[PDB]
Amino acid sequence: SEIGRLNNQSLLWGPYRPNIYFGTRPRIGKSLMTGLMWGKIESYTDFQHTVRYTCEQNEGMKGYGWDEYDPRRGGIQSIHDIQNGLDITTSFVKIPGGAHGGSWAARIKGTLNDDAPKDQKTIVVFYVSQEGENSELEAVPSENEFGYEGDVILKGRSEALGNYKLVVTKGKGVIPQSDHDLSRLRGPGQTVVQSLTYPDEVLWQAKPILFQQLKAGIDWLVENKYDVADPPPPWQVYLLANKPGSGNVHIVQKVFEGDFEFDILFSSESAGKEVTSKDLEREVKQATEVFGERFARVFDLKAPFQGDNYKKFGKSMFSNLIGGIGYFYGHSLVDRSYAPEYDEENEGFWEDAAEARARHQEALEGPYELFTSIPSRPFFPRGFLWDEGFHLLPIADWDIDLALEIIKSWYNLMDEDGWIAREQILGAEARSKVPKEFQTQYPHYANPPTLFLVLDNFVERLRKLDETLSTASVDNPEVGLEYLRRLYPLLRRQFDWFRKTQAGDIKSYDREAYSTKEAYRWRGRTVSHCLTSGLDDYPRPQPPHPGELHVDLMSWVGVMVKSLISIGSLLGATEDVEFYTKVLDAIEHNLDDLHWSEKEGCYCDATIDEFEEHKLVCHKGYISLFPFLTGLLKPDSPKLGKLLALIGDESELWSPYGLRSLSKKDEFYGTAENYWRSPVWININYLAIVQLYNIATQDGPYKETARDLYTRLRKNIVETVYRNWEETGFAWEQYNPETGKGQRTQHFTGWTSLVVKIMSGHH
């Protein structure tokens, strides 16, 4: 209980809004949130097009991301904006104290790049909102008549936060001054504040809210005879009239000419000592020192990646991944019809499922919360169930207690049946990024249970102030065991849920196998996809068929059952462990009986013929490797040897840049959207690397073969990701096996960051 409380206090605040360039919120659904906007203004109409707020990636943005980050301490983010001619640094640091999750500060620094006009005007906005019934927030009025010559002080209070103050400092930089007549009524140019109220549920809509106020300011000009015969300067037309007061929205606006900086200082009243800019600077220097030391210990990069260039690469890949952590809160859109068409029992089921979807029975439910890392700030800034299992592998190395906290957050979503939606779109803010047709979640749709892999690592570590907190759950075995005790029933529920909802059919068909129970089919396939498997367009049996069996899914059930054996054992769940043991024995056999192709020398998904007979459908690629990737095969298995042959075969899967998702020899190589039909994906490559390492470091007939393949694939993968990062500044979603180029989405950190752990080695 005590470690839980300390963890809660430690993690409460952060820049937990990775969907935007920079903002903060605590891990509380309805509370205080901040966000930064900026944009150059060169004309009367450009600012609407230049202003930055939500993360994107296009020609106008060179790059951005965290140079260092630890959610307990803070970090530094750098932003390279071509359109606005600005290199920005946002430094964020947390200062523990008091009873309400402590205090924090940020420094915003903007430096014009070499190309920008030296006298560029940049508008900067700090937007502050607070949601909640019995909470207050008020901007202390200025002494000056038109705005603020110095700091802006917000004083607020809530049940969650107690009393606090939020200061936006005067800052450094030239403030442009207008000699226009308007300055008699609006002042010559100064910091301004507007305090406003809207219904709580729309406060997230900062850009429209800001622009509504800018437009009202412009309508006032038109009405008051400021016109094109003698127009005020653009930056003055777009400077809000000062009107501070009480409200649930506060817009703090500054205009700078040239380079600029200012601070944001959040002081929790219960902590006593109010935060200063000198504290900010001290705490930032200290967090950097601590980050450096921890990285060198946790991610000790091995040959041939010991050099400084690979260290900087690793720090960037890691910091972007952990820096992607967000807190999300709100309702989710779910189809709770459980329409019988979703059972997918007939041939042509995808048409029936489409029919049921077309009834649009889905509705909002919750509210829910989630604390999670994300695949991608600009494109996918929300929780994805199987991606998180990969995200947490490096995060757990860094801070096991944080990883366990995220696992716990995810499992807190699980419904009475054992279902967790594979994509977590929580609240209107999260929905704004997602086309409506893709928001609805389906209680029959699974996703790989990769979060079990993180639990496996934790279990292994358990068997063998911010410093203390990060490892408390391993350093105190009783703490770790109690965590497992509480989570175990939900893990079991999910296991049971997979067997209930994703069962395949042995008995209806001419199908002979060691066990009549162990067989699995992903629900939710369409003619060209199986999105729930995670390998969206990997070739599957055609047509889809209720008699399909998917070897990757059976393999995942294998993973779960092994974790449940280890955790059950730890908890003395004697009866459960007997049941799991029988299940694992059955899967080990059924993998062979239902999915092994002797002819092809690999595993295959299966289907049922036009003649109602079992048929293997082999498409050599990631799926073919699954029992190996998931660690299910014995080290001396002859099947494992044939799988190693395939892995190392340059004419099949082995490219100079990593393992191809699909064989060059497959009929579907490079076809259609070509998403999982050739490109190199880091998450699956990582699993291969780990399993090769396992074989390489044990006595057996394939030790040497595995050692060679491990060494080479490690090097190929790291170097591909490194070269692209050096050249483009990005982690990419996947890599071209012909050219080695990064392709598909950028800022994929994201499981591409698994590269840091591959470099550290020593699995």
Ligand SMILES: CS(=O)(=O)c1cc(NCc2cccc(CN3C[C@H](O)[C@@H](O)[C@H](O)[C@H]3CO)c2)cc(-c2cccnn2)c1
């Ligand atoms: C030209 S495209 O056909 O290459 C292509 C395909 C897709 N698919 C839809 C889709 C939705 C959510 C997330 C992901 C990413 N990813 C897919 C992985 O396959 C999963 O395993 C993994 O969990 C999941 C999470 O990281 C993809 C999307 C885009 C896109 C969509 C919206 C905005 N921008 N771009 C482009």
